[PDB]
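ok posting inputs for the sodium ion job
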Amino acid sequence: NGNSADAAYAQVEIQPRANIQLDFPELKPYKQVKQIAPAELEGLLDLER
Amino acid sequence: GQKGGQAIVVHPDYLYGAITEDRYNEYVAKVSAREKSAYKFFHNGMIY
Amino acid sequence: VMLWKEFDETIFNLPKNKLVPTLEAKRDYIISRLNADFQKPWFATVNGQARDLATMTYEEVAKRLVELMFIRSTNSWFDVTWRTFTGDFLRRVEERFTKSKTLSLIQSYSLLDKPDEAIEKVFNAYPAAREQFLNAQDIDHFLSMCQNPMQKPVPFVPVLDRRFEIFFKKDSLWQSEHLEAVVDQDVQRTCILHGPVA
Amino acid sequence: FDLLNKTLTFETETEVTFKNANIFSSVKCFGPIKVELPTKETVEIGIVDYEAGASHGNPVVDFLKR
Amino acid sequence: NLKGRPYTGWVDSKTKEPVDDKDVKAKYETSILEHSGIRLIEPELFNG
Amino acid sequence: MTPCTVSPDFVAATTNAGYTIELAGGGYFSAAGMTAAIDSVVSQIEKGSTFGINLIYVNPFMLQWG
Ligand code: NA
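and the output
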């Protein structure tokens, strides 16, 4: 059948390269993050302090 | 020399409870942009 | 050609030591004029907004390659080597964003003959790459693929550096016969050679 | 036939027809298979019989060569 | 160029032979661990 | 003329119109590439027709295969 028949057969493998990340924290959607803290906290703190 | 110390660190997601949805979403956008730029800076600074 | 003329009188005549400083000073203007007026646009411009390779996502780059190299009107890659380019580029995306050895989602660059779908396939598997600028190493790899001499000169300027004149002037005769593959099929961008007396 | 510790010889002719410069349209490879006796005399014990359409090669000669 | 062929990526600092990220662990991890963390004091790191 | 008379079609058309034309080496990068274009011109022109080739002296790579 020739080296053609079994060259259009043999899959192509992908080896990983490193992709170093800064790992900034994940920001969840507001609806979900507002459940964590009490409802009352909104506008209660001086955020400069 | 009697140097006692304690710090308490609280999870950062307790902060976002204090602000409005509008303000949070603006922050999330701004961080996301800054983070992409920091990754750009870091990898360039590392290899060179 | 009038931009080409200005750049002859303004940039390509400057002594080598003054080339790179003038390029950095007029950077935004040069990009603006390439995009507006020339047959090789600034590669790194996304939704008509100027960028650099370093400030485009893997997805933005893959899409920009298809935008400039794949001719919608003829539903084909203007040259097979341009397909090989964006094929090799997508394989890099898989390499960078896979966490371990797997089989490529592009087993044959044939798949690129429906390019929109090829892109969706790869970035659906590696969605992280929609949200991250090019790793600095992959910028150098992209710019290296652009120097590949076994391939039709890339139809854009990927970087402003010492070799700007070669990027600008290289392979600029064919566009007048293949407007279908020029940015707005716009004659006004292209080199047509013609005598003033004939 | 007990083949163990025997020496076989393969006396083979191969007839071929062509599709083009590279691909054969047909490939035939036949001839007797012989066993060596204690006397060193080779004796027929069977036959090679290969027949094929479009091939790129003769897999009998390839096998016997290796 | 690395021996007339063009190359982008890691290279062993001594040999200047190219190195794939996939091989970094097999090639260097044993040495990384041997010469990281709490270990015998290496004089070249503290002025002899 | 590079963009213009690189096209084997236009070379054949001009040759078939009964006028001498130069096939432009300018648009070719290998012996194999031009051999294919020449073959196309030959296939399109009448028996006993002819054309010429233009090579650029200032391009030593074209000269060395050309
Ligand atoms: Na990875």
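notes: The pocket of sodium ion is lined by residues A 16, 18-19; C 98-99 (CB under 6 Å). The first helix of chain C runs from residue 2 to 10.
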